[PDB]
């Protein structure tokens, strides 16, 4: 009898090629039309390429200009060149047959099928931490799997996430601070996390607690982030202890030609640690002397992360507000540098808050388990968070392991002395409303909007 047998089905990255081929025990010549067709899981079959016994190729829509059908009647062999492919693609390929009788009638051949899988990993980690690291740890992924992983840093991924994880495809994995993925464990955007003892012994147990939302863990957490004084030793030798004392000092630095202190008014993360110094009347306190500085001049109204950090490597500013991921680009530039405690205002020291680096699988995902083997075995490893620490600093990571190097790093001392004068967000689905109504009151009041006292009054609402 005609027997149909495929063959060249396998795993790929899209853009990639794969070439299937399915040969029949019979004469092709016989045959009227030869085809693929292909069926994705929970699907209706559907014809992607045919050729007839007239050299006449048609081909559908979606993969028209990417695919060819083509034919060899020596090898007795139907072939399809699979170029630029992508995740749409992945199905079961068949190949079929139609011959027509020596009488009226016809006969359908089928093969047994061949399983063609185009996987991407895609990660979402923001530009201020260490993507090429993250790289180099998928790199070595692809090597033992076989799986392409992209490293993605979009604008405003903690607030684009929600809404294209939601309804498109997203990233796999998303890494942002732990405080915002209670909102996405609520809103349904979040796979649970099934560790394992063995991994879950691994890391601190006061870690997990972050990465935990109604007794369901929600992300892996990969390292505490706490804001430093970083400080340029040649141009300030003995920084500030307190803040009250920074006006002074940048009434002696202006006269030279250099200000006092640069850091990021425009997100509240940066702000936050003055406001909550004392603190209601705390936090009117702490927000009147912010204002007072941009109101005597001493600092820019609209300060940003970039001209901030631009500021001190070029040797413009003694201080600056800042995480470990900033070290980095310290470095590279020529200022001997210093990390200390954050200045005390009010006596009171000022309590930053404190973010756990978290990672997540997003939900509306296939490759969840794909996932899981890159964030346990590859990532969250001694050689997986070196590779990502290399190029931009994690700050005091989750794993137990790295405990003594920890310990030997003076930065590390200076955020984890921050840590603890400061406090672990909650993670609940309220975060978001309340840092929005942080970050519109601190502009509104650094630009001279609002008043300190109306201020207070439209975010506790
Ligand atoms: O600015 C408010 C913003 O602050 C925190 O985000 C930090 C993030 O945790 C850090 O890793 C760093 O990259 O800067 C961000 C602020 O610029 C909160 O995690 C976040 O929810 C909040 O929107």
């Known amino acids: 009898q005609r027997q149909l047998v495929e063959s060249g089905g396998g795993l790929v990255q899209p853009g990639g090629s794969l070439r299937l081929s399915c040969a029949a025990s019979?004469?092709?010549?016989?045959?009227?039309?030869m085809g693929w067709y292909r069926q994705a899981p929970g699907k209706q079959r559907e014809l992607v390429a045919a050729?007839?016994?007239?050299?006449?190729?048609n081909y559908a829509d979606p993969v028209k200009g990417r695919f060819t059908i083509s034919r060899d009647n020596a090898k007795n062999t139907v072939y399809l060149q699979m170029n630029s492919l992508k995740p749409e693609d992945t199905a079961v390929y068949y190949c079929?047959?139609?011959?027509?009788?020596?009488?009226?009638?016809?006969?359908?051949?089928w093969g047994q099928g061949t399983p063609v899988t185009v996987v991407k990993l895609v990660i979402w980690i923001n530009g201020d931490k260490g993507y090429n690291g993250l790289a180099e740890v998928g790199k070595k992924f692809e090597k033992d799997t076989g799986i392409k992983v992209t490293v993605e840093h979009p604008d405003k991924l903690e607030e684009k996430f929600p809404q294209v994880a939601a309804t498109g495809d997203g990233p796999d994995i998303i890494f942002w601070a732990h405080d915002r993925f209670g909102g996405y464990a609520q809103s349904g955007l979040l796979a649970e996390i099934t560790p394992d003892k063995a991994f879950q012994d691994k890391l601190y147990p006061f870690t997990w607690d972050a990465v935990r939302y109604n007794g369901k863990l929600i992300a892996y957490p990969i390292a505490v982030e706490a804001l430093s004084l970083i400080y340029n030793k040649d141009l300030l030798p003995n920084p500030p202890k307190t803040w009250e004392e920074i006006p002074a000092l940048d009434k002696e630095l202006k006269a030279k030609g250099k200000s006092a202190l640069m850091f990021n008014l425009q997100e509240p993360y940066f702000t936050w640690p003055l406001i909550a110094a004392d603190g209601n009347a705390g936090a009117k306190a702490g927000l009147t002397f912010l204002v007072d500085l941009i109101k005597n001049k001493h600092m820019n109204a609209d300060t940003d992360y970039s001209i901030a950090e631009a500021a001190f490597n070029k040797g413009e500013t003694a201080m600056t507000i800042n995480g470990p991921w900033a070290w980095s680009n310290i470095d590279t530039s020529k200022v001997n540098y210093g990390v200390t405690v954050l200045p005390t205002f009010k006596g009171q020291p000022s309590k930053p808050f404190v973010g756990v680096l978290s990672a997540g699988i997003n939900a509306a995902s296939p490759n969840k388990e794909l996932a899981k083997e890159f964030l346990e075995n590859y990532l969250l490893t001694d050689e997986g968070l070196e590779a990502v620490n290399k190029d931009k600093p994690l700050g005091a990571v989750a794993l137990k392991s790295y405990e003594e190097e920890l310990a030997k790093d003076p930065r590390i001392a200076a955020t984890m002395e921050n840590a603890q004068k400061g406090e672990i967000m909650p993670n609940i689905p309220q975060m978001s409303a309340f840092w929005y109504a942080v970050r519109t009151a601190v502009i509104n009041a650094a630009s001279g909007r609002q008043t300190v006292d109306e201020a207070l009054k439209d975010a506790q609402t």
């Open positions: 079929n047959a139609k011959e027509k009788g020596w009488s009226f009638s016809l006969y359908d051949y």
């Open positions: 050729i007839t016994s007239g050299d006449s190729t």
């Open positions: 019979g004469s092709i010549l016989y045959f009227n039309r």
